[model samples]
Target: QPAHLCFRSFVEALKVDNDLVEINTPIDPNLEAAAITRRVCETNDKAPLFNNLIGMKNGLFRILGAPGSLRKSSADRYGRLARHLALPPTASMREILDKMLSASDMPPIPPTIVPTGPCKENSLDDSEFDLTELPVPLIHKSDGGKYIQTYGMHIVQSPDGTWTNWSIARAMVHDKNHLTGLVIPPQHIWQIHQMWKKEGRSDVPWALAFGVPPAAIMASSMPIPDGVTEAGYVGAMTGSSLELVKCDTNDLYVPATSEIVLEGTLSISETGPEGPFGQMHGYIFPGDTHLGAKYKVNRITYRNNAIMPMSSCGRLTDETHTMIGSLAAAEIRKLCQQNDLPITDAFAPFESQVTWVALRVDTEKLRAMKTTSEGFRKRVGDVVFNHKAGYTIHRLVLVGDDIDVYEGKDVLWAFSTRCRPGMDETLFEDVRGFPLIPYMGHGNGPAHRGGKVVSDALMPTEYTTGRNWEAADFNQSYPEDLKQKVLDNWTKMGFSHHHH
Candidate 1:
């Protein structure tokens, strides 16, 4: 397989590629580790592997940050993200999107059960463990509490045991045995939790696995439809069956090779305050605390020298903008195509902070349909705005095929020059939206159920007529031979090699 199914193997692969930095110097977990991690993400540096924590056993546990983030200085900007998605380091955006899109075409392969594995090497029962004693990082200064579950996947199943769901959500260390996490009803985790509540159960079984398989984490980040288990999709993604072992205290199964596993139950009868923490949208409202599900930890399992992965999700270019952004873009593209839209590509520019989704339409095919500008824009919105991925997306920009949605400058140029603000924009109401978006809760709206727009960057006339102009960029403006000649003599012209 192109991707590593084992978390340790993934770290080793990063080490071999010089994409990871192992830090042995003792660091305080309070905010030191998190501060360094935040800096690493901002500077696009190598992922940090913290091997030592102050006041903790040397190798009892460790921390990893920016596992699925990008390194802008490298030629393979998307290399780290690419590897996590089961692709070679040299893969580009197009290849990454193609890989994800194709994974949906394959039949899902359910996980294979195993008696025991690395995760079961060590275990701590409810009476023997204390989460407060662990090195859970205080991710931000203004946060409510130290968050223990940032990048880990939470595994949950329905009351009937018919549907299993794996998802990602932030959870703060509430006390020695409890964790408080966001449990919005729209999310699959909350949906499953509700199922258990309706069955007259006081709590729902859950397991949080850290440092899971690279492909599994990526699939977990995707905004796939409800009732679709991430295990099967992850298996389909990696082209192999994921090996899972039963949890020590729960019926739920976790990746056999996971670095750490916390088997717990989320209480339906109780709730606690969560948030006021820095969010992916790059803002933290001081008094934004809300009631969240309280999770009671029952057991903890891990391998030797366990590593807990973290995503200091405050700004751009982190997993929030890489894994979540790219996966959402790919899923949206698939949804559009499945609905018979002429979209050729889709992307969420990291600069947009995961809010804007750019859809590149095949103008040729779009024109053949002879639809009006409003009709085409509405169709695009209808397909995406009513879907699961749509909830996370706040704005959609439709561009012609000539534009590469992956290029931030190209997308900005198209939106500014082609889109007539008032005339080309379509707003929808009554559809669900993600409340995590900073503005959704405070901004004018029906409590995160409105304020979504689709801006048509395509000129109105282009809907029926061919392109009346060409892009002035070198790739689009010049002849192939002329461009090749210039490129061949670029060094001879006293110019350094130029690459984008």
Candidate 2:
């Protein structure tokens, strides 16, 4: 572990010029920002520092979108993710994923409290605060309301006040004075809310922080177990305890360097209808909605000229699908290892958002378990799909160690060749699912319980024990030296621009 820089440091290290976009591009906060940022992500452009978002009076706040997106350049593809984990600027995808998985076993390390942080530079109590005044971006065209905070870390404590949880969830402005959003059940926040309800309490104390330490933000997106503080895993990843400052309105400690903080209470008795916006599943649940009366904002706090990180919800490659889903996949890998499974690698491939997760298992270890194909598939599926992250995910693709789950083309190829559609796919009916999913709520069926499936893409027992049919093209058939020569002489081979 090593001492690392903050978000500002990472931006500076990348030498990104903060030159504001000057074109009178009439940028709408809702769909416009998402549209621009989506193209930026696709083209591997610099993180947009939008100063003049549509519908905002100048000087409200500067916005940064898609801060940790992957780039096309091989060398810099993982720079943002690496910086978030406090790794060297040049850390690779493999390095980042490995470090994340390694830290999952570390014990919870609460943050070290300090006197003050930048979030306290300015404060607003019940009287002076109005959430609508903030430049809460309207992400998508069909979104119901403006989302003020989507990527920030939410801090909540158990009802007994013994354990604290730090995680991320969506939040939208309810009115000028209040904010409303989902605090999903079975999640850490929901668990705490349940405790408060059982105790006959109406609200739960909470705080949402933005522009937090890169490591802290990354940890917030992970699906670690309950009662485990992200502060500890962050420390293990960055090799030092995070410096924290107590919130003005609560006992929760926020990162000393966070840009914005929303201190509030979540009501267990309240309920509000929300949604009809596009979800990470790449489709919109047109008439789908949910009761989101769990969380209510009571106070607002932030530094002068704070930068709010906004996520424009839409298709994959956005923060919701890429950053959050990748972290969940790493957590899945860690969970499998903890359960003594034969999993070697796992990834929630971008195409399926967070719904479809794939695991690469070691066949030798699988054989030692002395389980049938159905038994093996059920065990892996039950472990992941039954957990918190599994709530949003309905599809699990289990492959053998020979296949790399992260490669999309390889995964699709495996599914096409090995999977026999209905026969190979194990469907689980009547399982709880996320309402935001288009197929779950809008499909032609009952909404409460939707079907989920585990596509076991691993080679069949007969294929493995009997004669194999085909050899892999890239890794198996090609000789190392010959492949290297072709790659080295690509220019002379008349391929001026080679496509990876």
Candidate 3:
């Protein structure tokens, strides 16, 4: 597992176990593929690999949809992520969280530079490229255009060429030689773009990578601190140095085993209207468009017969919310722990569509720290709301250690009884929010300031200090012998579903 495997390995594995579902039925990229994948993932079907797209040429591309839907019996649906880190297949969520936090605290380990990689097997210059042939799927029916890269990572650098960044953002296929997409003003990409503008540069060199190391893809979804190289963190997470190959047209190094690499320059002179695509929030805002903005696709390169991964963005279960958002919550937990806060676990429930995150705190530890409830709530809000992950999330729920944040019913119950709207809720104004969110920039009316609410739902100080009402459930108070007898005799008593 330590050896670098091509994207083919994952695809082949899925094929052998009959985990790959091939839709020989020709499907349109717009809404058709999206509808099929949505139903399939919702019903927990095998991963779909679309080999014959309605409009695509034979050798242009293939799309891999829903790469990480959690299997019921699998310990971590994120096993691919663990494998990227060189960890065993059985790594638990707790272990994954700790691994990331530990790596963040350790020093950065730069990648090992190699002369070449599979990503460099082929190359195209500005004049030789025609992006129209690429099978950029039109993810939704109402989308403005075909989105070529949604789940992939974009690699960019500061103006001084000192700091390199790897982040994920959606991009659409605009023309035969150009693409247009949002580079959110508050994100690292926007900051770097501003630096280039300040330096009077006309265009910024950029690379979009697909089917990269699983750990690298996970890290791209996280909100790591600015000025840190993702390649280094990816190295530490995998417990080995990342082997990188220099881009044919730029100085930046990309994962040697990447499936496809697009060498391009983000243009400063052009702009174009970009989106109406359905986002993770389950709504479409027609006005949320990037107009006339240009991303000049200079060269297209890839390994032979490369596998392109696609994320059909919608309500839930897609890579956007499940893979990206879940990883974000885990990283936020790591940030809280690094700050010596009393938080134990953090989860962005799938129901919230990546906008709400719940932080679980150990009550004993909180009391030991001697921190006031008000102070603890403010501190937790400040750290999470100001960090990288905070840019997209609008609500943060703080729960007690005894509660399982992953269980939607449990979280809702805690919020219903413990949170007093005005008294228990804390709101912050003028905070940064991703424009991709429907309500922020393109809805009925603009929400001028992206507001955030921190609800402290842990048992109030008065309740924790006094005796609380106890158990109605059998597991809470029933005698062990009686419970065993009931379980042992249920089948004989004609209860066919009993556990024996």
What candidate 3 gets wrong by more than 4 Å, as runs, is: 1-5, 16-18, 24-26, 72-91, 286-288, 369-372, 442-448, 462-471, 496-500
> Candidate 2 — which pairs collide?
30-138, 30-139, 109-232
Give the per-residue lDDT digits (tens) of candidate 2, residues 435-458: 667666667666556568888787
| True lDDT of residue 184, candidate 1 | 82
lDDT score at residue 287, model 1, on the 0-100 scale: 72
Name the runs in model 1 displaced over 4 angstroms: 1-3, 58-60, 488-493, 497-500
- What's the lDDT for candidate 1? 0.85
TM-score of every prediction relative to native: 0.96, 0.90, 0.91
Worst 10 residues of 3 by lDDT: 462-471
lDDT of 3 by residue, 1-500 (tens): 23223455666655664556887777777667767777766665677888777666535566787765543335545554455455664576666666765667778888899998887777777877677766677777778888888777899999787888998888888889888887766678888888887888568988899988767777777777788888888777666788888888877778888888888888866788788677777877655465735687777778776778777767766677766677778888877888888778888877777788888887777766766657777888888887776777888888886578877677787777777887888887656666566666654544546567888887666224532544467876789999999999998999961111
Clashes of each: 0, 3, 10
- Report model 2's TM-score to 2 decimal places: 0.90
| Top-down lDDT ranking | 1, 3, 2
RMSD values, in order shown = 1.9, 3.2, 3.0
Report lDDT (CA) for all predictions.
0.85, 0.71, 0.74
